[PDB]
Short mmCIF file of C-alpha atoms and ligand atoms in Angstrom, two decimals:
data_model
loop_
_atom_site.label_atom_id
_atom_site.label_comp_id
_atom_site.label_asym_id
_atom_site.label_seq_id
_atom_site.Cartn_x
_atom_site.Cartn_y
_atom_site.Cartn_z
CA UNK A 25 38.63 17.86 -6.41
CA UNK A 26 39.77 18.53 -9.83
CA UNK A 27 42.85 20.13 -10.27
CA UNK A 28 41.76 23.75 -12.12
CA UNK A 29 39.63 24.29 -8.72
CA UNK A 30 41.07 27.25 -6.71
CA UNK A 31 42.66 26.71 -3.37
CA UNK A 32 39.37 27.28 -0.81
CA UNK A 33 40.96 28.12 2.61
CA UNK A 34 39.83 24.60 3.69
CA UNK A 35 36.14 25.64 2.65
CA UNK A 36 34.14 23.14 0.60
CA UNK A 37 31.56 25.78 -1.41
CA UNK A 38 33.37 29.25 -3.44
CA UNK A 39 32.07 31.14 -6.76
CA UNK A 40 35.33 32.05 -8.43
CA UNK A 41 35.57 34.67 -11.03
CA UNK A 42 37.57 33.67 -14.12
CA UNK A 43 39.87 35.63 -15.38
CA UNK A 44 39.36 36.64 -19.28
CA UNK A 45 41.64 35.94 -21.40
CA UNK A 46 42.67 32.92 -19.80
CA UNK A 47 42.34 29.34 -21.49
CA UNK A 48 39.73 28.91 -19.14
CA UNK A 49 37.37 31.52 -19.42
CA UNK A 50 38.43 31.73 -22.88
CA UNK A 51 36.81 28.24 -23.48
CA UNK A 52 33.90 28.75 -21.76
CA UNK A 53 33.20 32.03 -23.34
CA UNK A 54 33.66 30.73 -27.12
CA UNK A 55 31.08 27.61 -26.01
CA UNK A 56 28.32 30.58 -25.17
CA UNK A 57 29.71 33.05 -28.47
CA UNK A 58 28.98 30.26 -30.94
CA UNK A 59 25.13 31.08 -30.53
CA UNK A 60 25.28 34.53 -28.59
CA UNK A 61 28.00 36.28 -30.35
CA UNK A 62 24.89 39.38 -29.89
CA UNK A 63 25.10 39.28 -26.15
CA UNK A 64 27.09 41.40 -23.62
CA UNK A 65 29.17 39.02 -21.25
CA UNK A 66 29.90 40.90 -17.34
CA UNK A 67 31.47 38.03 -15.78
CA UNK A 68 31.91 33.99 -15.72
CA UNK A 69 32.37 32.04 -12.43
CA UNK A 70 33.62 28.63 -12.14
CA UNK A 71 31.10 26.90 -9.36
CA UNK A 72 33.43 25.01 -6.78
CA UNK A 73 31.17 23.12 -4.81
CA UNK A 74 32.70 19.76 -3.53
CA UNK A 75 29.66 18.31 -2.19
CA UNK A 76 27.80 18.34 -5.56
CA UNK A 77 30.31 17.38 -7.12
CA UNK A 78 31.64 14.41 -5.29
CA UNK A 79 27.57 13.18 -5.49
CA UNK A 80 27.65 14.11 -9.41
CA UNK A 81 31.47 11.97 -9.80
CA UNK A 82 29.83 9.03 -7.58
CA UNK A 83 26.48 9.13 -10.20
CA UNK A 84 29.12 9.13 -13.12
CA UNK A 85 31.45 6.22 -12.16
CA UNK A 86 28.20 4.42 -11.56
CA UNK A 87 26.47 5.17 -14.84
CA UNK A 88 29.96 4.25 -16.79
CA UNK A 89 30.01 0.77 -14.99
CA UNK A 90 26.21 0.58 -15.76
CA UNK A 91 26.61 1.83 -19.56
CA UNK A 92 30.38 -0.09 -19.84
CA UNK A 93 31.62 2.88 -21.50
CA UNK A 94 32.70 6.59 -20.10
CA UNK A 95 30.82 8.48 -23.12
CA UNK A 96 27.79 9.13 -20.89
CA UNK A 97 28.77 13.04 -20.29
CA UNK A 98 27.58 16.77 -22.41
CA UNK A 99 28.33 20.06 -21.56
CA UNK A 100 24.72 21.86 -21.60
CA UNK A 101 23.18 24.71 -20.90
CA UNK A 102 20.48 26.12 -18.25
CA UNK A 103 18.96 29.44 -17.98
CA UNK A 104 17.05 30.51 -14.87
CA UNK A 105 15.76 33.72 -12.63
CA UNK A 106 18.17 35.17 -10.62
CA UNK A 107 16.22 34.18 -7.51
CA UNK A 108 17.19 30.59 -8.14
CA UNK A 109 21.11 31.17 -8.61
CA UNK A 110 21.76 30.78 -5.00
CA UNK A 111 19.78 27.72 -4.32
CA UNK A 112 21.38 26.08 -8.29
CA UNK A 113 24.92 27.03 -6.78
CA UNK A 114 24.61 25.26 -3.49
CA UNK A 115 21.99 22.57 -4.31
CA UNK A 116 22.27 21.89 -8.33
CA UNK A 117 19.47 21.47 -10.01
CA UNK A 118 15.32 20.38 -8.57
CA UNK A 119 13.02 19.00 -10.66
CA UNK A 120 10.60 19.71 -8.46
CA UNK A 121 11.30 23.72 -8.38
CA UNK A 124 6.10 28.11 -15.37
CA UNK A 125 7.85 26.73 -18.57
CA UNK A 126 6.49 24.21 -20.65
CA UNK A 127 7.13 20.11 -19.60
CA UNK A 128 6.22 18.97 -22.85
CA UNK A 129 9.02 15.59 -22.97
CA UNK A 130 8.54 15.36 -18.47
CA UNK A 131 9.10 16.67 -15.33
CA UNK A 132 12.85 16.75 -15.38
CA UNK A 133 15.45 19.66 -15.43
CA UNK A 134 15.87 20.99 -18.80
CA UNK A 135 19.00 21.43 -20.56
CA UNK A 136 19.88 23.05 -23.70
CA UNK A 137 22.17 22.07 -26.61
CA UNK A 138 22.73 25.33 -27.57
CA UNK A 139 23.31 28.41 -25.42
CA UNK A 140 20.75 30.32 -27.63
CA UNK A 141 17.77 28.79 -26.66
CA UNK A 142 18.80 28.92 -22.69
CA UNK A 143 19.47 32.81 -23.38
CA UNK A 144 15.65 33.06 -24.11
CA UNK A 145 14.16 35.57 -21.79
CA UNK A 146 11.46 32.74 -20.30
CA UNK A 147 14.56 30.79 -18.50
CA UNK A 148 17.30 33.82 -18.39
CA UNK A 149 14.72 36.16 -16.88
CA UNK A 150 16.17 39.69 -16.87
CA UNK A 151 16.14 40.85 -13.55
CA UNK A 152 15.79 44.38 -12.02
CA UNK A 153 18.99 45.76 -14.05
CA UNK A 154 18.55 43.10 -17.37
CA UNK A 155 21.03 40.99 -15.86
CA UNK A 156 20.51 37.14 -17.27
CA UNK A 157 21.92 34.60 -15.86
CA UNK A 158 22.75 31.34 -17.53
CA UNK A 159 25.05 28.11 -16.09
CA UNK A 160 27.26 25.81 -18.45
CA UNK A 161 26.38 22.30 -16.80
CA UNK A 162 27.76 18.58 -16.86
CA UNK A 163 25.33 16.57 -17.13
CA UNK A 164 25.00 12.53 -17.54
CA UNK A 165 23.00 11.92 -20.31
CA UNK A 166 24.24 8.53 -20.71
CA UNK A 167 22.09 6.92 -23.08
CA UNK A 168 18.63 8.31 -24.43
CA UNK A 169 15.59 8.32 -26.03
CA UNK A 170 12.49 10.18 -26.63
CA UNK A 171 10.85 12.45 -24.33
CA UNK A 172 7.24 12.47 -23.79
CA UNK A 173 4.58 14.75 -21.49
CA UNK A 174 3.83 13.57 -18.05
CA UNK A 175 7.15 11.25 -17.33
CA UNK A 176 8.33 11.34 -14.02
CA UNK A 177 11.58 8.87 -14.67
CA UNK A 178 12.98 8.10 -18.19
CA UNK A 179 11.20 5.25 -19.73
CA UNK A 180 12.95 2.09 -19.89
CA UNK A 181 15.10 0.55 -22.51
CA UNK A 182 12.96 -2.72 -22.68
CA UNK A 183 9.17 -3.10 -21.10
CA UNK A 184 9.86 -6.62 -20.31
CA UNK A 185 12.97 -5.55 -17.62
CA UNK A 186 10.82 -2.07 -16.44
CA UNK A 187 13.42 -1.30 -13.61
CA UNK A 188 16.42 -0.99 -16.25
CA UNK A 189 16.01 2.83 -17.65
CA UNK A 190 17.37 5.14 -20.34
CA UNK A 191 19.58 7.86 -18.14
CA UNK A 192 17.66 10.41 -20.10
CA UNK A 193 15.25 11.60 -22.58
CA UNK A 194 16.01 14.67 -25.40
CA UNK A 195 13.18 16.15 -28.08
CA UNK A 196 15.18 13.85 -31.33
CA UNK A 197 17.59 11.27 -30.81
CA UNK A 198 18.88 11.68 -34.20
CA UNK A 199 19.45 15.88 -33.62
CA UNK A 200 18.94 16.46 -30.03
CA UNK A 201 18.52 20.34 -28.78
CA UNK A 202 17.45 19.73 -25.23
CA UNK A 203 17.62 16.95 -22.69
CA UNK A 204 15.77 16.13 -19.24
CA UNK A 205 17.00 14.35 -16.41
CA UNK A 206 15.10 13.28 -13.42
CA UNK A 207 17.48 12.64 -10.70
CA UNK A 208 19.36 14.75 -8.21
CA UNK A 209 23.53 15.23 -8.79
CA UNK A 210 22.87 13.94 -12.87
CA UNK A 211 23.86 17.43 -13.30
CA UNK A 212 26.52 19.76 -12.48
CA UNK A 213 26.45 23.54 -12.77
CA UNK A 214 30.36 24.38 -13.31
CA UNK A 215 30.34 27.67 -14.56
CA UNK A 216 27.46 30.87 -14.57
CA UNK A 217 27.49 33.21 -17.11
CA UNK A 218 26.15 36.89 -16.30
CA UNK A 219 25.27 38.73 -19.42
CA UNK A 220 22.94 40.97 -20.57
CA UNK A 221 21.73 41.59 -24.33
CA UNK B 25 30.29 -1.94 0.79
CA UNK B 26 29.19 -3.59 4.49
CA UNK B 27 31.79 -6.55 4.93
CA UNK B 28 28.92 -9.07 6.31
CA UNK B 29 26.41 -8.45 3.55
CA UNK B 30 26.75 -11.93 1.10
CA UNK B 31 28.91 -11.57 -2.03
CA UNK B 32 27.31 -10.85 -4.69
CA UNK B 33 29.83 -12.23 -7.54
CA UNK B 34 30.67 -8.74 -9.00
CA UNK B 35 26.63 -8.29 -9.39
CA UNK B 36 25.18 -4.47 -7.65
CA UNK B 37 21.94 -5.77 -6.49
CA UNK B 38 20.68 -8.78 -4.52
CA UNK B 39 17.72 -9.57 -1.68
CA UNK B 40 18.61 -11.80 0.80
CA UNK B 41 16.27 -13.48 2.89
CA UNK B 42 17.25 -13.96 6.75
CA UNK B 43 16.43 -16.60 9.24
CA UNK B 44 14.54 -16.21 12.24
CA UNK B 45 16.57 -16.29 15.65
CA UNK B 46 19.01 -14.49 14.41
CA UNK B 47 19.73 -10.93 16.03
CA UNK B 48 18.98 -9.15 12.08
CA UNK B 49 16.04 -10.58 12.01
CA UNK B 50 14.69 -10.81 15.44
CA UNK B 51 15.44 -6.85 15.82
CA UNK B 52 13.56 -6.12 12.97
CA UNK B 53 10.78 -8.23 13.76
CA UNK B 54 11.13 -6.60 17.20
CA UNK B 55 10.41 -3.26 15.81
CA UNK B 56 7.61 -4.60 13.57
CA UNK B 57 6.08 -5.88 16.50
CA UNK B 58 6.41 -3.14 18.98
CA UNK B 59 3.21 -1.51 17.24
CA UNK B 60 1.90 -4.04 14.60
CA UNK B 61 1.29 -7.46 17.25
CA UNK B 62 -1.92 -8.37 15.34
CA UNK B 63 0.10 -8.78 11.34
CA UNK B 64 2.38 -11.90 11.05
CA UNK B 65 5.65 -11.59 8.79
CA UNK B 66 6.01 -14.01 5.94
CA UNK B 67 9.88 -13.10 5.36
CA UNK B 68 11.98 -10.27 6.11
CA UNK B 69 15.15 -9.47 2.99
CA UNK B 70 18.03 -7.40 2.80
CA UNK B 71 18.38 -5.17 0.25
CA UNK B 72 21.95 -5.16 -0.88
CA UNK B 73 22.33 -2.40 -3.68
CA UNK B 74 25.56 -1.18 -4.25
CA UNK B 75 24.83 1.93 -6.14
CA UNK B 76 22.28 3.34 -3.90
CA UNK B 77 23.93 2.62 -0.67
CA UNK B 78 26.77 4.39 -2.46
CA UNK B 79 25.32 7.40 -3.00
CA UNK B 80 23.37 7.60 0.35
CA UNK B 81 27.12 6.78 2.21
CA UNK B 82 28.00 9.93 0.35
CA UNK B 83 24.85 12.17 1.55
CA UNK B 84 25.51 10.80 5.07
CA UNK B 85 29.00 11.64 5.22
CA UNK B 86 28.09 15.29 4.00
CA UNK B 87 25.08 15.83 6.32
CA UNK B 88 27.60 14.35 9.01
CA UNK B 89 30.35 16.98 7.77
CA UNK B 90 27.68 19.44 7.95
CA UNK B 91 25.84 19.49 11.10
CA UNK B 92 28.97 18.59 13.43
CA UNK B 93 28.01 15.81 15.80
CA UNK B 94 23.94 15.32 15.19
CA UNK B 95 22.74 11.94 14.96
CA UNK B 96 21.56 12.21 11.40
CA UNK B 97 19.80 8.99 10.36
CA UNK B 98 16.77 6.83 11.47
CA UNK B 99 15.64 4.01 11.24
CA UNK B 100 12.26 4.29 9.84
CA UNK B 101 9.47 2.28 8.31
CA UNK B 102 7.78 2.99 4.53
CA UNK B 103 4.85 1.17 3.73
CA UNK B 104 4.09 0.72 -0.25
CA UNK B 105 2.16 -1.13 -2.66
CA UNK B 106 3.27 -4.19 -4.42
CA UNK B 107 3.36 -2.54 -7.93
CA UNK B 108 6.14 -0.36 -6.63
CA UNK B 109 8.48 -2.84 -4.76
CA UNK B 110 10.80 -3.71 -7.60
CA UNK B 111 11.22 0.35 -8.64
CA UNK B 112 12.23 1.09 -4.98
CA UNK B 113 14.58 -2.00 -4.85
CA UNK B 114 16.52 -0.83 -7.38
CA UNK B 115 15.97 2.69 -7.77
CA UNK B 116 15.47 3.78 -4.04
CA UNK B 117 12.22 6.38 -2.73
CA UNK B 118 11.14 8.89 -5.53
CA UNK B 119 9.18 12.00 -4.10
CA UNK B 120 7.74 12.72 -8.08
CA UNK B 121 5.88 9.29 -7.38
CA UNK B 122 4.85 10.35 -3.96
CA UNK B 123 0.87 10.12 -2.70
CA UNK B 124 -0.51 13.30 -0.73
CA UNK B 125 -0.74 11.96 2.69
CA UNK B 126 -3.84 12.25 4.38
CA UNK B 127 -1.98 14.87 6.68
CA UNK B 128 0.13 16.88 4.11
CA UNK B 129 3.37 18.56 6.04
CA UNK B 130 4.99 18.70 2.56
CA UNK B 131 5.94 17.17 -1.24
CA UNK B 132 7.78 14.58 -0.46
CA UNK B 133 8.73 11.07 0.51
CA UNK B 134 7.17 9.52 4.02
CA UNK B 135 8.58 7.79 6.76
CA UNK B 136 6.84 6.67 9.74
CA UNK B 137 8.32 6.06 13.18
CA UNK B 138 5.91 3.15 13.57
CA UNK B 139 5.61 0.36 11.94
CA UNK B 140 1.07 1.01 12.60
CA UNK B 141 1.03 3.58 10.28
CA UNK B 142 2.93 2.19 7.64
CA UNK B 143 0.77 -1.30 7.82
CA UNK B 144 -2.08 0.84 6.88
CA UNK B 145 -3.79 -0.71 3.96
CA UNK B 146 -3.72 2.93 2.17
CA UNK B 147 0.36 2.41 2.54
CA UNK B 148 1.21 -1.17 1.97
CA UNK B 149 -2.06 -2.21 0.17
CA UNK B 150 -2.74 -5.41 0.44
CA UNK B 151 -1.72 -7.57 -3.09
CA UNK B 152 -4.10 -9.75 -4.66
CA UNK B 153 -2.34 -12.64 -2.79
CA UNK B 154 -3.16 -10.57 0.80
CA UNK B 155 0.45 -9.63 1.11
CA UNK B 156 1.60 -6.38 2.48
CA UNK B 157 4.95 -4.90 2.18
CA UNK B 158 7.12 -2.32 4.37
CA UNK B 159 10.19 -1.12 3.76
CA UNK B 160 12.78 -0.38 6.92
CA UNK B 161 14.86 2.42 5.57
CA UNK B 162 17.70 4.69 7.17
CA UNK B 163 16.95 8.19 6.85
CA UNK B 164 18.77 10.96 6.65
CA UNK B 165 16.16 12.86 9.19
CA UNK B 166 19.31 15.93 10.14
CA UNK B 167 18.11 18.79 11.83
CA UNK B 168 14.36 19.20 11.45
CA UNK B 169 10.89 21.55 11.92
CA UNK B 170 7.74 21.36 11.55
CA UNK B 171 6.59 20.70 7.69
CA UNK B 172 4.07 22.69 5.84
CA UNK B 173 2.04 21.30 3.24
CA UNK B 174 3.43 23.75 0.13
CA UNK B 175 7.09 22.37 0.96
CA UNK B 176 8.65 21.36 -2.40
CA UNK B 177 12.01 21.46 -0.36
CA UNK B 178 12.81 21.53 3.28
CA UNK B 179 12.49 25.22 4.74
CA UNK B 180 15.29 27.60 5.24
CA UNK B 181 16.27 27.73 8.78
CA UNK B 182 16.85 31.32 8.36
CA UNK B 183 14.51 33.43 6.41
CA UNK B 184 17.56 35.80 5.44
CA UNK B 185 19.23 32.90 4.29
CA UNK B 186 17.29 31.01 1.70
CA UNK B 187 19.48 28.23 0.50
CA UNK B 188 20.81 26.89 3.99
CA UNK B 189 17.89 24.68 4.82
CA UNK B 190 16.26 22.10 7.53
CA UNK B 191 17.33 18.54 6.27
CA UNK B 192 13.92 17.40 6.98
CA UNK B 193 10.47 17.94 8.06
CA UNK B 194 8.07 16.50 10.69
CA UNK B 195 4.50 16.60 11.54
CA UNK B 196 5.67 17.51 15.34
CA UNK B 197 9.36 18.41 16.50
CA UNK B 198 8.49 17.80 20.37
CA UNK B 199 7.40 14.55 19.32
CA UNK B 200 7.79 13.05 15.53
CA UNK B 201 6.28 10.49 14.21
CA UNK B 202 6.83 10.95 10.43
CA UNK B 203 9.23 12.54 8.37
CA UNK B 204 9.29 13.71 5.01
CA UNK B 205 12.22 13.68 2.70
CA UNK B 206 13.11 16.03 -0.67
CA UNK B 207 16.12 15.07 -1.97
CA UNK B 208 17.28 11.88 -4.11
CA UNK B 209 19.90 9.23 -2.00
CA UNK B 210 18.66 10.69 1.41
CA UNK B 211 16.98 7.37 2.51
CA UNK B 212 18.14 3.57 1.71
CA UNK B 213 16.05 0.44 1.64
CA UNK B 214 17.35 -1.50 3.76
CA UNK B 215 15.13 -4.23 4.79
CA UNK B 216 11.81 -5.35 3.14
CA UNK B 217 8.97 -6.72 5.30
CA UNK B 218 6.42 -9.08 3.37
CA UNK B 219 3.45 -9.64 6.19
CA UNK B 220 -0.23 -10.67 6.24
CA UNK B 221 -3.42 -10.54 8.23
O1 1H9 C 1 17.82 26.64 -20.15
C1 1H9 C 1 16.68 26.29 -19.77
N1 1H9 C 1 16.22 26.71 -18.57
C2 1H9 C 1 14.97 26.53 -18.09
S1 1H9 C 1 14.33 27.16 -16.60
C3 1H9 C 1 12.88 26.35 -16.93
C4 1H9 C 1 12.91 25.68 -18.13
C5 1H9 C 1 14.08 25.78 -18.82
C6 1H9 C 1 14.50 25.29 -20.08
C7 1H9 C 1 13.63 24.52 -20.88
C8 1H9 C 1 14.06 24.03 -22.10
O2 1H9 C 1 13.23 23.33 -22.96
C9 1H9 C 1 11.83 23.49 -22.72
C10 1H9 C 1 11.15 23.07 -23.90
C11 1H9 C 1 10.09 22.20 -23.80
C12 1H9 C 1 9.36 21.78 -24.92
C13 1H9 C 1 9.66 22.24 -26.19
C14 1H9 C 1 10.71 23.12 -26.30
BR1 1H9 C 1 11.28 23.81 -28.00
C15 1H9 C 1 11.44 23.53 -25.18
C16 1H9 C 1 15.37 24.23 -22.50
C17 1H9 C 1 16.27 24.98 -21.72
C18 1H9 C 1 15.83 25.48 -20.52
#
């Protein structure tokens, strides 16, 4: 478990606070400000969840044996409900839990904290709270999304087993990627804000 | 990785055919058998792939972790059509390329606790050569209820407590004979039955 986790009593799932004005938070906090410098920030958590994450570092070592390099990683973002924080901080993220699908039925991640901070995924709840994670995920190499995909398509259709690890709106400027497999992603810190 | 599978030369996937008369094949066909006398098998492989046994090893461990001391995995059968054999021998059981079963206890992947319902044509449809195939897979069945045909994910066991849930479903707990599966890595192909009329 990596080595800016938190001592967890022996326990293998804990939402830690960060502490602002901390290298830490302070990172994570400048990644959101450089497209929500309007927003209020109440808190950031680091997500320590060792199951997730030993499935996500498994996926990874795989992928950079598979790609033959270790550039397959982004730090994204996700916006959701706050009725799905519980379930993305134990489980990750389910393609299979409104929003539009338009490049396939994957998990959507955004390039830029902006768009996640859109009131469709950040839903305000009862008291305008939004909630948005900052998630790993393995985008390894992509092309192309397109409606209706259920995987990624593949890199060649003569070898139709052997698959891009992703798929993004441009390949040339992408703003949002999709991945369709469990543990490709890793929520590692939620951001509670309001606007 | 298992030390008697053959070495695969640095290479992460292989099938290996097995002999009959030997104990891995003789079980299998055994099982086959038990419920499906009136098929013949042509050949019965081992699926060797590193990656996905990897990351099922890992969900076992954790469901193991988890539960404290339940016999978590099955051995169960999964009956498919030929178009789909080399996806799932590389790529492992996808529930967003399931059917709806005929009885729907959820959205998911099914596995059948004999080998009869999985030799149903509408599983493993016969080929144009008259070939059907069947998958022998170890499941990560857990602790399970009774599945509902709205399940996009296994059911909380607790209503209070959303996001601590079943680790599968089944059309009967007293007496199961299918499972259903929601999660990526929770079931390996491990064997794959080619077998005619
Ligand atoms: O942060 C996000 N959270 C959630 S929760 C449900 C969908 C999304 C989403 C979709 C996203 O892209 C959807 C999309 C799909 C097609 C065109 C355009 Br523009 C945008 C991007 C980010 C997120």
């Amino acid at each position: 478990l990596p080595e800016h986790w938190t001592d967890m009593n022996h326990q293998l799932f804990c939402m830690v606070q960060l502490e602002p004005g901390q290298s830490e938070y302070n990172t994570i906090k400048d990644k959101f400000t450089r497209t929500c410098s309007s927003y209020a920030i109440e808190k950031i958590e680091r997500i320590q969840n060792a199951f997730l994450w030993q499935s996500y570092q498994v996926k990874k070592r795989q992928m950079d044996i598979k790609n033959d390099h270790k550039n397959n990683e982004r730090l994204l973002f996700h916006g959701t409900d706050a009725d799905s924080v519980p379930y993305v901080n134990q489980h990750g993220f389910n393609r299979s839990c409104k929003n539009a699908v338009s490049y396939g039925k994957g998990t959507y991640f955004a390039v830029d904290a902006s768009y996640s901070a859109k009131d469709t995924y950040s839903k305000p709840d009862s008291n305008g709270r939004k909630h948005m994670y900052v998630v790993r995920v393995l985008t390894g190499v992509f092309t192309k999304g397109r409606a209706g995909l259920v995987t990624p398509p593949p890199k060649n259709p003569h070898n139709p087993t052997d698959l891009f690890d992703s798929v993004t709106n441009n390949t040339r400027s992408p703003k949002l990627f999709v991945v369709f497999f469990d543990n490709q992603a890793y929520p590692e810190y939620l951001i509670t804000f309001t606007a």
